Amino acid sequence: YADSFVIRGDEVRQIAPGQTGKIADYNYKLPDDFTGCVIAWNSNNLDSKV
Amino acid sequence: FASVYAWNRKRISNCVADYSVLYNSASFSTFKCYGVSPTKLNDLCFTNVYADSFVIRGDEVRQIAPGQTGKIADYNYKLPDDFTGCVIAWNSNNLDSKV
């Protein structure tokens, strides 16, 4: 399974098992026994507009 | 792009320049002209246009201004006090920075 989205800078910490915040408990929730991997990278050039 | 201590310089003449495509595309963070009104650039006729290109840190864009002091202005690139023209600066984090 591959899931994709876009978040803010500080929110990459919230994408982890046993996490609390706003996105973690309202938009995307990870099971505690999750197995797999998570990849994140910057896209300020492309996804940001003046 | 070239480094600041060897800033690249080009001269352009005998050309028909469309300055609209520069002004409309607002992706440039800093768009500051000094001697002229930026919106009027498509109405004046010139010769011997000079374009200097380089890459610098984010902090030092404020040092690219007439009558400025610091470390890069007085060692690498000094502007004349009576300079006339314009300065363009925009972000290049995607390709010019590596993990």
Swiss-Prot record, chain B:
<feature type="disulfide bond">
    <location>
        <begin position="33"/>
        <end position="86"/>
    </location>
</feature>
<protein>
    <recommendedName>
        <fullName>Spike protein S1</fullName>
    </recommendedName>
</protein>
<feature type="region of interest" description="Integrin-binding motif;">
    <location>
        <begin position="57"/>
        <end position="59"/>
    </location>
</feature>
<comment type="function">
    <text>Attaches the virion to the cell membrane by interacting with host receptor, initiating the infection. The major receptor is host ACE2. When S2/S2' has been cleaved, binding to the receptor triggers direct fusion at the cell membrane. When S2/S2' has not been cleaved, binding to the receptor results in internalization of the virus by endocytosis using host TFRC and GRM2 and leading to fusion of the virion membrane with the host endosomal membrane. Alternatively, may use NRP1/NRP2 and integrin as entry receptors.</text>
</comment>
<comment type="subunit">
    <text>Binds to host ACE2. RBD also interacts with the N-linked glycan on 'Asn-90' of ACE2. Cleavage of S generates a polybasic C-terminal sequence on S1 that binds to host Neuropilin-1 (NRP1) and Neuropilin-2 (NRP2) receptors. Interacts with host integrin alpha-5/beta-1 (ITGA5:ITGB1) and with ACE2 in complex with integrin alpha-5/beta-1 (ITGA5:ITGB1). May interact via cytoplasmic c-terminus with M protein. May interact (via N-terminus) with host bilirubin and biliverdin, thereby preventing antibody binding to the SARS-CoV-2 spike NTD via an allosteric mechanism.</text>
</comment>
